[PDB]
RNA sequence: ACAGAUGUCCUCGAGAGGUA
């Protein structure tokens, strides 16, 4: 279990919520198929996103039983899990899968080390395990060479733009297809696919998706939405989109801390007992619920602040919130050093918000756009709050107390470790000291505003890059109250250019034979972005891989010229997956605008490929732009199995429409309103619960031990509409005063 | 093969409706519990006759609490999915494990050592169905299926049903 | 819920006798001879697929003037059927009762008889044998054409061995069937 | 986060003025302070008792919140 | 009476003022009454559960 | 089986008797149920029974089981209260 | 892609000395 976890489960213990899987009755050997069309025990579902990263990377190279086969036992493993999840959710309006893609230059420079890492594991590893074979066939023992080249699965291998990826695409359609002409609940079931051409992180892609169904007038704002995902930070992501019937479904991490991890050897000891005991055992992975509505809640009790020259606003109290939870922490930009443990400043951070907001006449936020003078003041309190946290955090290490090292050499808690601190980055000169602080100063505020805007309003750069390994200290961004942030949009990169900024190490052959010749070459031309022993490995603090790496970062220009000099010389079958594409929606034989779909596009129209049918949510759903598919998909046709070894009987096209997928454009810039006719959910919370979150509660002391305990009673929560008025009943009369009548 | 009970079943009615429309709450309880009930012992209740007649007895109160344990004497239509009978049914579903005749409130499933080598699947068809020579059973289609499942009675029933032996078919 | 009193030591008979077979053998709880709730020894009834349609029709027809009233005091073919059934269904039994309504197709677009002289005629008919009333109650619901179908499709059947009666009264049923 | 939590505190007003003792629980507005000389808790409000050092100093009032500190 | 034992040869417990961090499954009762070596000086007044002595193994 | 109007046991209520309605009464009226009498500015539970009892005016009924097993069953307000 | 900690009560059989 990690720490953000554990505090988010101390914090607000009722967002914990368990699960109702399904049990397929056994008989005779044979097993029920278990029924789709049936009512949902963890309430009715519309709508359903899925990160496909999130689950063909856990089943690919696990901790417990490698694939033995080829691909075919991941695919096999990947199409279970997803038919398990479908099973376990059963969304009956739209089915969105989605894979990780093209993503913006932000997310290179810590995607790159942290694949470099993880190839220099896998060589250690293989050097290891070379050396132990060597070993052993000193004694006398033989070891057939099958055994020997065995190695591992090349996790680093994964990356959009191999032909995994194209593979793994392939293989879905046909999973998707398969299960919507097999299974009657899947009748209004619309499915569609992003691949890992189309650009995006898998998240973002959602994000985009989401924000295009809410573009349209007659979107029904009661829909429910889940996401899937192993990520920590897509259950705070999803509390941005500013739907309160949210909830995120993900793996009972809980239970998995201390799960079964016992030895393949001791399998076999006791013989059928064991084996059956195990195999019973694991059949079964608890998961649990992550509801948002309830959290919404407890997000209003817990930012209010008494007195404010302007309006109290929910929706607009929550992005503070998200800003500062990602200024504390994400996946784009270096740690500060201030924010290292990033639970315990997240409520100092946020006692500071409430002394600073009095002083400030306006919101933090506006849209997304972050108010820079308020922001400022922010920031200049943290900076005079942040010696009394940076001098505790060091009396806790010496208490405590009592690859390159730099931050040990830094000895922060002496005083005068303004410079102390950067000349562990850079070297020991006066002048150079303000100016490397204003440049991250500058740099720092770029990429917050481009990670708000990417994580508000969707990507707007596309190409901005943080070039600097190392956060700046407390007290920064002093004098910046004169820049203006204007963001460029760019141009995504292409998959091979996406796929050599990610840079894999020598390890990995998932290059064409160009590529690889233009690299392996001692005399190349960005030879000296490449290192091979990897020594950059750097601790400062924490432990083991979550070190940072130092290598130098990536010219765009250099691989720009080196992929187009590749380019000509490549073969055109290779070339051909150079096409950004678009996502694919497919939808059943039975579906309510089956029929207007294929009497206006693949019809007798026959129209020269550029005829495009927009529709609303009214009729069926899935509001977005229809194109004509450009893969071989044509009417009374036939679809190969790409499984091969798997047994899945053929389909014909008469089944399953394909069609390309365009999302909406947005019309106007996404705000954060709730749409009208909006019904919120049932009342759960007590005042109770709202004092609870109001008193500072020492992670409840451990008085009674209320942190752990009757977790199971907690029971489910209904969701979902409840009341055709929109509207508590506050005073006023005749349906109220009747309510008040009946209550009182 | 419906079958015409007198079952019983205990309501404890609470306190707070121990009023003069307790009768109508236990009736409306009893309704609102008893239909669409899968029981294992018994089956499906699909509605109960008699409404205005069903008797009530004196409730007896618990020692440990104020509640009253009601046992009612209700009669209602049963449905059983029992076991050696042949049954006429309607396909719902078609899949590569078999195909879900309908028996009224009942699915029953055939695997795949069930039926005879006389049937393959396929998808060539507009309706996924089982297609060989003299055989033609499709998404909505009748047939004619002999139970022989274990039921397998917790909380829920349900059944098997095999195709061997002729009869079993469109007809 | 139960209907019966324990007896002939119910409590560790272990297996007493396997779950009922083709060839007869009713289980514990839907023997012959039930107990009634007002006296004893009622006979188990013979409810055919037909008659079964036209209980619950009864029944749901019965109920609908019920609360009708009580309101009131308190202020083609199958296409024709399956109309008539669900503007009953939508209000009558209320709540959920999603299993209601597949039974009652199940018993409109398969009802043998459609008509109470019809049902009354093939029960006074089935009245003059002695068999398990399950017997009669299948051979009544399924339609069949020869002695080894019906045996076969229905077994338990094999105390008739002169088939001419079993002829006779099997085209009594398919005549009527037709009559519909 | 309360400040009135393990400091040495003397009683004022009531019929315990210039008693000495040890706050040990606080919640809310009432304050449980211990006896030195007398074997009993008594709860009274934190702003009516003053504050004064562990070791031993001058007294001060409920302004130890601006302070955010000792002594 | 408080004693230290010695556990095998390194695993010896120690007269300390335990802290929530380093140390685990501590009491319910205060712990600012003992000083660095973990004893309370004499001549300070207690009460109910209060830690006289600070172990830690 | 229920000895019809035959029955041969006292037409007066016992101790144990009175306890037990009292107690059951008064932990009804404690939680949320209807009472059939007025209460006339009275709030303890107990007293309420008492009260109700005073005229007889509980819809209980008192089964009294022979030792063979019959029982027979006798209306509160038919009982009387002497003790 | 991802991921470093906590849940509150421990004796148990005996022996001895006493109180109503
Ligand atoms: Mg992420």
């Not at chain 1, 894979?99 to 190839?119: E, H, I, L």
């Not at chain 1, 050897?265 to 992550?290: A, H």
């Not at chain 5, 010695?6 to 003992?34: A, V, W």
Request: with cysteine; proline share 5%; aromatic share 10%.
């Amino acid at each position: 279990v990690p720490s953000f976890f554990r505090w988010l489960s101390r914090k607000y213990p009722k967002i914990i919520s368990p699960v109702l899987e399904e049990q397929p009755q056994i008989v005779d050997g044979v097993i029920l198929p278990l029924d789709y069309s049936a009512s949902n025990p963890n309430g009715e579902l519309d709508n359903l996103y899925l990160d496909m990263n999130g689950i063909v990377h856990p089943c690919s190279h696990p901790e417990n039983k490698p694939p033995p086969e080829t691909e075919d036992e991941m695919l096999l493993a990947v199409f279970e899990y997803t038919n398990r999840v479908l099973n376990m959710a059963r969304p009956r309006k739209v089915l969105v899968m989605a894979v990780d893609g093209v993503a913006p230059r932000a997310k290179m420079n810590q995607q790159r080390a942290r694949r470099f890492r993880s190839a220099r594991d896998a060589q250690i590893e293989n050097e290891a395990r070379e050396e132990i074979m060597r070993q052993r066939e000193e004694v006398g023992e033989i070891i057939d060479d099958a055994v020997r080249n065995k190695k591992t699965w090349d996790s680093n291998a994964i990356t959009p733009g191999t032909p995994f990826m194209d593979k793994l695409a392939a293989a879905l359609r046909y999973w998707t297809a398969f299960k919507l002409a097999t299974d009657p609940g899947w009748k209004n079931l619309q499915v569609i696919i992003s691949d890992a051409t189309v650009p995006g992180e898998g998240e973002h892609k959602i994000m985009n998706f989401i924000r295009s169904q809410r573009a349209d007038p007659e979107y029904n704002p009661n829909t429910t939405h889940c996401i899937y995902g192993l990520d920590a930070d897509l259950i705070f992501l999803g509390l941005a989109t500013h739907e309160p019937h949210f909830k995120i479904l993900r793996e009972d991490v809980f239970a998995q801390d201390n799960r079964k991890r016992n030895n393949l050897k001791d399998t076999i000891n006791m013989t059928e007992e064991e084996k059956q005991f195990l195999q019973k055992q694991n059949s079964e992975q608890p998961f649990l619920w992550l509801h948002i509505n309830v959290l919404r809640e407890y997000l209003s009790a817990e930012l209010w602040v008494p007195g404010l020259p302007f309006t109290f606003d929910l929706e607009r109290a929550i992005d503070d919130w998200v800003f500062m939870c990602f200024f504390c922490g994400n996946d784009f930009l270096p740690h500060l050093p201030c924010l290292d443990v990033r639970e315990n400043s997240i409520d100092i951070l946020l006692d500071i918000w409430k002394v600073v907001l009095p002083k400030l006449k306006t919101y933090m936020t506006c849209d997304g756009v972050l108010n820079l003078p308020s922001v400022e003041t922010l920031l200049q309190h943290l900076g005079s709050r942040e010696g009394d946290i940076f001098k505790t955090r060091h009396i806790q290490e010496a208490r405590k107390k009592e690859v390159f090292d730099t931050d040990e050499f830094v000895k922060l808690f002496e005083p005068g470790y303004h410079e102390r601190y950067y000349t562990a980055k850079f070297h020991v000169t006066p002048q150079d000291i303000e100016q490397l602080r204003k440049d991250m100063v500058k740099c720092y505020i770029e990429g917050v505003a481009w990670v708000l805007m990417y994580y508000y309003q969707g990507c707007a750069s596309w190409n901005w890059f943080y070039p600097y390994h190392y956060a700046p200290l407390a007290t920064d961004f002093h004098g910046f109250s004169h820049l203006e942030i204007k963001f460029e949009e760019g141009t995504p990169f292409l998959p091979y250019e996406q796929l050599m900024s990610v840079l894999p190490a020598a390890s990995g052959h998932a290059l064409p034979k160009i590529f690889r010749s233009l690299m392996s070459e001692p005399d190349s031309e960005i030879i000296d972005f490449y290192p091979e022993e990897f020594p950059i490995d750097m601790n400062g603090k924490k432990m083991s891989w979550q070190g940072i790496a130092l290598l130098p970062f990536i010219d765009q220009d250099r691989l720009l010229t080196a992929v187009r000099a590749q380019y000509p010389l490549l073969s055109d079958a290779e070339r051909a997956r150079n096409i950004r594409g678009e996502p694919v929606l497919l939808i059943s034989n039975k579906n309510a605008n089956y029929e207007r779909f294929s009497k206006k596009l693949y019809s007798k129209e026959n129209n020269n490929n550029n005829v495009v049918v927009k529709f609303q949510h009214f009729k069926s759903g899935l509001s977005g732009i229809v194109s004509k598919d450009v893969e071989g998909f044509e009417l009374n046709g036939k679809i190969v199995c790409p499984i091969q070894g798997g047994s899945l009987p053929n389909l014909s096209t008469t089944l399953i429409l394909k069609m390309s997928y365009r999302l909406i454009p947005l019309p106007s810039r996404n705000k954060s309103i709730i749409l009208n006719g909006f019904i919120p959910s049932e009342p759960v919370l007590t005042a109770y619960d709202l004092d609870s979150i109001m008193y500072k509660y020492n992670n409840q002391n451990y008085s009674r031990r209320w942190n752990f305990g009757n977790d199971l009673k907690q029971n489910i929560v209904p969701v979902g509409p409840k009341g055709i008025t929109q509207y508590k009943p506050r005073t006023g009369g005749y349906r109220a005063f009747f309510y008040f009548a009946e209550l009182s | 093969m419906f079958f015409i009970k007198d079952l019983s079943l205990n309501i404890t009615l609470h306190p707070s409706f121990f009023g003069p429309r307790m009768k109508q709450y236990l009736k409306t309880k009893l309704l609102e519990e008893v239909e669409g009930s899968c029981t294992g012992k018994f089956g499906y209740i699909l509605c109960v006759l008699d409404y205005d007649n069903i008797d009530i007895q004196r409730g007896r109160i618990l020692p440990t609490d104020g509640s009253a344990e009601f046992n009612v004497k209700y009669r209602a239509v049963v449905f059983k999915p029992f076991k050696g009978e042949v049954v006429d049914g309607t396909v719902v579903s078609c899949s590569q494990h078999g195909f879900e005749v309908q028996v009224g409130p009942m699915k029953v499933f055939v695997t795949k050592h069930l039926m005879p080598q006389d049937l393959t699947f396929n998808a060539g068809s507009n309706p996924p169905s089982y297609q060989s020579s003299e055989d033609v059973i499709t998404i909505k289609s009748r047939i004619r299926v002999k139970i022989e499942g274990c039921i397998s009675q917790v909380s829920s029933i349900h059944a098997i049903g095999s195709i061997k032996e002729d009869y079993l078919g469109a007809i | 819920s139960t209907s019966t009193f324990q007896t002939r030591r119910r409590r560790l008979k272990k297996v007493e006798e396997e779950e009922n077979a083709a060839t007869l053998q009713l289980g514990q709880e839907f023997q012959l001879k039930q107990i009634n709730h007002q006296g004893e020894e009622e006979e188990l009834i013979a409810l055919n697929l037909s008659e079964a349609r036209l209980v619950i029709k009864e029944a749901l027809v019965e109920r609908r003037r019920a609360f009708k009233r009580s309101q009131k005091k308190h202020k083609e073919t199958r296409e024709k059927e399956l109309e008539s059934i669900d503007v009953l269904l939508e209000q009558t039994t209320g709540g959920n009762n999603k299993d209601l309504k597949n039974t009652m197709q199940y018993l409109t677009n398969f009802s043998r008889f459609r008509d109470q002289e019809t049902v009354g005629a093939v029960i006074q008919l089935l009245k003059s044998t002695g068999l398990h009333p399950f017997e009669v109650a299948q051979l009544g619901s399924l339609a069949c054409d020869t002695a080894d179908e019906a045996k076969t499709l229905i077994p338990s059947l094999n105390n008739k061995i002169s088939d001419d009666e079993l002829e006779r009264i099997l085209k009594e049923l398919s005549n009527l069937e037709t009559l519909y | 986060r309360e400040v009135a939590l393990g400091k040495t505190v003397r009683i004022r007003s009531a019929g315990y003025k210039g008693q000495l003792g040890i706050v040990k629980d606080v919640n809310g507005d009432k304050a449980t302070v211990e006896l030195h000389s007398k074997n009993k808790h008594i709860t009274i409000d934190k702003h009516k008792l003053t504050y004064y050092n562990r070791e031993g100093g001058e007294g001060i009032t409920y302004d130890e919140l601006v302070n955010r500190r000792g002594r | 009476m408080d004693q230290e034992k010695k556990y095998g040869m390194s695993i010896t417990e120690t007269f300390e003022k335990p802290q929530r961090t380093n140390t685990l499954r501590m009491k319910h009762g205060t712990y600012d009454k003992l000083d660095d070596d973990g004893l309370i000086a004499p001549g300070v007044r207690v009460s109910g559960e209060d830690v006289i002595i600070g172990k830690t193994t | 089986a229920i000895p019809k109007d035959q029955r041969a046991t006292t037409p007066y209520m016992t101790k144990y008797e009175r306890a037990r309605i009292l107690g059951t009464r008064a932990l009804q009226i404690s939680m949320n149920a209807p009472v059939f009498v007025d209460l006339e500015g009275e709030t303890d539970p107990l007293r309420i029974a008492m009260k109700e009892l005073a005229e007889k005016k509980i819809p209980l009924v008192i089964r009294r089981y022979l030792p063979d097993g019959s029982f027979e069953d006798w209306s509160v307000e038919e009982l009387i209260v002497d003790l």
